Amino acid sequence: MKLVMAIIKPFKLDEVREALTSLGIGLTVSEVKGFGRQKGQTEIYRGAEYSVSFLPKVKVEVAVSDDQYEQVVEAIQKAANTGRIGDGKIFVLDIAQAVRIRTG
Amino acid sequence: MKLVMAIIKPFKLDEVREALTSLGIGLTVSEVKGFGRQKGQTEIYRGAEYSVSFLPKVKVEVAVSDDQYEQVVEAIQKAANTGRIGDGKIFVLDIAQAVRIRTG
Amino acid sequence: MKLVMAIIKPFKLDEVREALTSLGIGLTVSEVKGFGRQKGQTEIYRGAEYSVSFLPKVKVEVAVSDDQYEQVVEAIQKAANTGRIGDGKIFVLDIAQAVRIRTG
């Protein structure tokens, strides 16, 4: 199995989820802060440049079978794409083992 | 080493932690939003079905040695289990390398 | 590629980020709750010991090339280090595949 981790623009989430549901995929979502090319505003306070604005991102973590992860990566990438800065990244990690807690 | 990631019902956390402490395991906990078979309420607003309720989950991330990860997976699964919908998932990922920041 | 996951003291974040920027590294940050040797206060309420204080941590997740991950691990470890309890951990995970959403 593969854990597909997508850091995306928050307003893209439901388009990504519709793309996932289209492929027969449940997922787990987190709110995170993004640092990268696109920057927020800062302010100097006591020898440090403090971030005064921040760039919310949505992290989608979804476990999938090896036989669908490539299709899932492309669907997320196409559903999350705008062509503008701050689009984000997809990281695929291998799952050594997965368990369904409800049944075992 | 293995990174064990458990998405569980929030009210199960302290039972899972007691199960971990029983096996000699520190852990890191996140609040996440769950999508899956169990669904929340939605509402139509401007060409989109907006989620008006959500399903909080607790994400437990705990790094363990290979010689205890199987026991850890089963303990979390048994401590997190209710037999009801929304129980969640456990994903085990391989750790290429781990570092204790305090000592190096 | 490698996904470097660092659980650190929140007040260390900007020092870690400066250490990352020094090496030519964007990153994704989460707020998490820490359990470990350093403990918070609890209170007995209805057959359970409830946590009344908690230990905020910052989770840094940064994807890097294999040819810089060791340097990145050490830079984070040195920038996040205080020598005091609660310093945290670094877990390195292998990335099977990464995608830039903006371009594909």
Ligand SMILES: Nc1ncnc2c1ncn2[C@@H]1O[C@H](COP(=O)(O)OP(=O)(O)OP(=O)(O)O)[C@@H](O)[C@H]1O
């Ligand atoms: N090395 C990284 N590791 C983890 N997350 C990253 C990394 N680089 C960027 N990100 C995430 O991607 C988000 C957007 O990145 P950035 O602001 O660089 O725009 P981008 O369009 O993705 O850039 P580009 O497409 O040129 O790589 C960031 O806010 C951050 O959450």
Ligand SMILES: Nc1ncnc2c1ncn2[C@@H]1O[C@H](COP(=O)(O)OP(=O)(O)OP(=O)(O)O)[C@@H](O)[C@H]1O
């Ligand atoms: N593919 C997935 N990847 C990541 N997290 C998932 C995935 N599927 C489900 N989850 C997580 O599991 C939680 C519960 O899942 P769901 O609502 O389907 O009930 P369940 O009892 O776990 O289902 P079942 O046991 O039938 O698989 C979700 O809210 C979500 O956080």
Ligand SMILES: Nc1ncnc2c1ncn2[C@@H]1O[C@H](COP(=O)(O)OP(=O)(O)OP(=O)(O)O)[C@@H](O)[C@H]1O
């Ligand atoms: N097994 C673990 N898996 C994931 N995160 C952990 C684990 N153990 C500790 N952590 C994280 O590390 C943080 C600090 O750990 P702890 O309180 O044990 O202090 P420490 O200085 O890191 O301990 P030591 O250096 O002696 O291992 C915790 O609050 C938790 O977020």
